Amino acid sequence: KPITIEVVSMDWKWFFIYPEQGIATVNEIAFPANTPVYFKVTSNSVMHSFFIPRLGSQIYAMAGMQTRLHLIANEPGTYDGICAEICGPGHSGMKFKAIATPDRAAFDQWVAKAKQSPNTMSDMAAFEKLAAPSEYNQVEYFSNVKPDLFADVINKFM
Ligand code: CUA
């Protein structure tokens, strides 16, 4: 089973959503190796560029629209992610890490850990507070997420 990951590029950090499992994160994602991954991408501000050099994969993120990317990580390990288009002050620290696990069980562990988080992203005041301008954000998980947050974000521009 391929995993679907939603991505919202914010002013100088990446917000990730896992619609299926009901968890969200900041600057870090995990998923099984040799497994298909579908990234549904958008931006809540200016235009950014989602890039992962060691997988040779890239895609732009613009407000109001949804872009798509598909990929398979051939080997387990962490892969560095960067924002490849100048977008202001925190351009250089607008990075993320992707962890391709050795199996699904290991991926299901990362997820469980995410569910043990006290932070949630289940309302309007949570999302906009996160969206506010910050730089070099450290990893962060959210145990819950608003049911249709991706669409909600996009349609603010629609
Ligand atoms: Cu976003 Cu550089």
Side-chain angles (χ1 to χ4, degrees), residues 2-123 125-158:
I3 297 77
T4 301
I5 294 166
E6 306 183 326
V7 184
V8 186
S9 62
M10 305 185 149
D11 254 358
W12 326 305
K13 75 274 192 163
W14 306 93
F15 177 41
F16 296 92
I17 305 172
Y18 283 70
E20 320 101 292
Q21 300 82 357
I23 56 173
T25 75
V26 170
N27 298 356
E28 181 185 297
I29 42 176
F31 51 74
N34 297 295
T35 302
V37 177
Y38 311 147
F39 287 109
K40 295 169 69 172
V41 186
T42 194
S43 165
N44 72 330
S45 186
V46 301
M47 183 179 70
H48 295 279
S49 176
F50 179 90
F51 185 32
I52 297 172
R54 254 210 295 139
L55 251 39
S57 313
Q58 133 86 221
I59 218 66
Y60 288 81
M62 304 159 273
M65 320 282 128
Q66 179 195 290
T67 42
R68 284 148 110 158
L69 216 203
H70 287 238
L71 67 291
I72 295 202
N74 55 317
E75 341 173 80
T78 314
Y79 295 89
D80 280 356
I82 65 172
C83 161
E85 202 208 310
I86 59 176
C87 47
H91 175 63
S92 299
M94 186 163 188
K95 316 193 167 199
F96 65 81
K97 294 197 176 188
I99 308 150
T101 67
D103 63 9
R104 175 162 281 262
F107 161 68
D108 297 326
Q109 286 179 20
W110 178 86
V111 167
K113 168 172 72 191
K115 271 164 173 182
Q116 292 162 8
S117 176
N119 320 285
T120 62
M121 185 50 81
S122 222
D123 88 307
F127 186 82
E128 299 292 339
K129 284 295 120 63
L130 166 57
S134 66
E135 300 184 28
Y136 305 100
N137 288 66
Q138 300 300 279
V139 184
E140 166 167 18
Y141 312 110
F142 298 98
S143 50
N144 255 241
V145 191
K146 193 176 179 63
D148 294 292
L149 183 59
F150 189 64
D152 285 17
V153 172
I154 295 177
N155 76 244
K156 297 191 302 163
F157 311 93
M158 231 75 175

